[PDB]
């Protein structure tokens, strides 16, 4: 909680006030100083010490209710949450992960491991829906933080939790690092719409390790093998270097030196 | 702490116990659970855990102890007990590895004292 911590709030939220969130949120992911053929690089997890791994994302919502995500630097992703004197972690891949989360929240005396781990396909099971049709928007992230706050006080079924955690993770992480996502979700806040994200979406986040590693292996931006993604009407296409993704994608996972 | 062990006793060796891992006011079929041992003067051993799709046993009780979820609870089966296996028996929400290693979030309670 010494990590840094962003603020954002539902209550009042306006294109500009969810732009200089997410632009606040990528500033603190990375400082910007590696960039290959224009695109921001994470920090790599070697060399990264532990008390520069985690940022924390505050929400409030119209009920002044609280809940913290904690995102890991090294690939933008939601590990877990705090809500009062609860906080509870997806399940690691591995140890070494494992042992970096419980640097976070350590004033917590209740903090819990999830049986199930962050990956968008068991999320969804256990939400009860896909991705396509959960809405996202202000409506759904005002929902969510709600959700997220009453699951330590038993107010909060597992489904509903999931749901939560899909709609927070693609309106931070997935909005950090894509300025794509981004720009769907200023649209549905500026014309207060809930909706579910599209395949285009959908196929970005996928696809965000493969395109990070095309772009860091390419030669001089041109890719050694295409990336597949899907239009909004679900037909697949193909990436076959970085200029198409400037405008799209905003920061990438380290995966080798430049 | 929320997560409450139970069970605990005295048999001979062959002998058997089951202990209970259990909240009053909610499920852990949520949660990744480990069940530790502790014996005097040293530090918790993972015994046995459970999280979605993987359950891992301590080479030392394997094909003797059995980790389950039922009645939203997370049960120790313990059979062919040996006197090695005495110790004060912990449980608690923590990641399921193989070998069970131990990766504390440091919050315990009083555990369940276990002598064969």
């Known amino acids: 909680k010494q990590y840094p911590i962003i603020n954002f709030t539902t209550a009042g939220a306006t294109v500009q006030s969810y732009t200089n969130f997410i632009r606040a949120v990528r500033g603190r992911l990375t400082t910007g100083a590696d960039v290959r053929h224009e695109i921001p690089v994470l920090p790599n997890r070697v060399g990264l010490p532990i008390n520069q791994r985690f940022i924390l994302v505050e929400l409030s919502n119209h009920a002044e209710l609280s809940v913290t995500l904690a995102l890991d630097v090294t690939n933008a992703y939601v590990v877990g949450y705090r809500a009062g004197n609860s906080a509870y972690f997806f399940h690691p891949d591995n140890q070494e992960d494992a042992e970096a989360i419980t640097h976070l929240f350590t004033d917590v005396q209740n903090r819990y491991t999830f049986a199930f781990g962050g990956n968008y396909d068991r999320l969804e099971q256990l939400a009860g829906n896909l991705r396509e049709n959960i809405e996202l928007g202000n409506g759904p992230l005002e929902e969510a933080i709600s959700a997220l706050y009453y699951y330590s006080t038993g107010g909060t079924q597992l489904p509903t939790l999931a749901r939560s955690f899909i709609i927070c993770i693609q309106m931070i992480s997935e909005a950090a690092r894509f300025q794509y996502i981004e720009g769907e979700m200023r649209t549905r806040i500026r014309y207060n719409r809930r909706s579910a994200p599209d395949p285009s979406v959908i196929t970005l986040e996928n696809s965000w390790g493969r395109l990070s590693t095309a772009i860091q292996e390419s030669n001089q931006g041109a890719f050694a093998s295409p990336i597949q993604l899907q239009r909004r009407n679900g037909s697949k296409f193909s990436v076959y270097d970085v200029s198409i993704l400037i405008p799209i994608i905003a920061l990438m996972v380290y995966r080798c030196a430049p | 702490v929320q997560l409450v062990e139970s069970g605990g006793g005295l048999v001979q060796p062959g002998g058997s116990l089951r202990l209970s891992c259990a909240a009053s006011?909610?499920?852990?079929?949520?949660?990744?659970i480990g069940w530790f041992r502790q014996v005097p003067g040293k530090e918790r051993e993972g015994v046995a855990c459970?999280?979605?799709?993987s359950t891992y046993y301590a080479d030392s009780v394997k094909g003797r102890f059995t980790i389950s979820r039922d009645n939203g609870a997370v049960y120790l089966q313990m059979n062919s007990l040996k006197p090695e296996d005495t110790a004060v028996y912990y449980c608690?929400?923590?990641?399921?590895?193989?070998?069970?290693?131990?990766?504390?979030?440091?919050?315990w309670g009083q555990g369940t004292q276990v002598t064969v």
């Open positions: 459970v999280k979605d799709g």
């Open positions: 608690a929400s923590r990641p399921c590895f193989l070998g069970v290693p131990l990766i504390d979030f440091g919050s």
């Open positions: 006011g909610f499920t852990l079929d949520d949660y990744a």
